[PDB]
Design a protein around this ligand. Sequence first.
Ligand SMILES: CC1=N/C(=C\c2cc(F)c(O)c(F)c2)C(=O)N1C
Length: 109
Amino acid sequence: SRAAQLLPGTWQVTMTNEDGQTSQGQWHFQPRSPYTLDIVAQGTISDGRPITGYGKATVKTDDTLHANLTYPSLGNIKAQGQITYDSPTQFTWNSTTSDGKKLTGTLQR
Ligand SMILES: CC1=N/C(=C\c2cc(F)c(O)c(F)c2)C(=O)N1C
């Protein structure tokens, strides 16, 4: 998977959520196997809430992975979504939180 092959390391993450907030931060990827990478998440939401999270991305196809994250700094809510390749330096994030809220964003280098 080319997508999985590009992901190792640090990406700048920006998101918007359903409540009209934005977040800025990073996702750090660590490959674990040919199909899997671990994630650690750090950032801030526009209302001041700090983001501390972690999770795992699993290869689905050449350009798509499914990722589950959990966020101890956000009352342990979770997020499940797809990481899709856009370019060697950009991925897109489309997910739903465990509160049923839509949460999308981008990964950039
Ligand atoms: C920037 C950023 N926002 C993240 C998560 C996140 C952002 C939000 F705005 C949420 O409402 C929420 F539930 C999770 C994340 O992991 N990073 C790195």
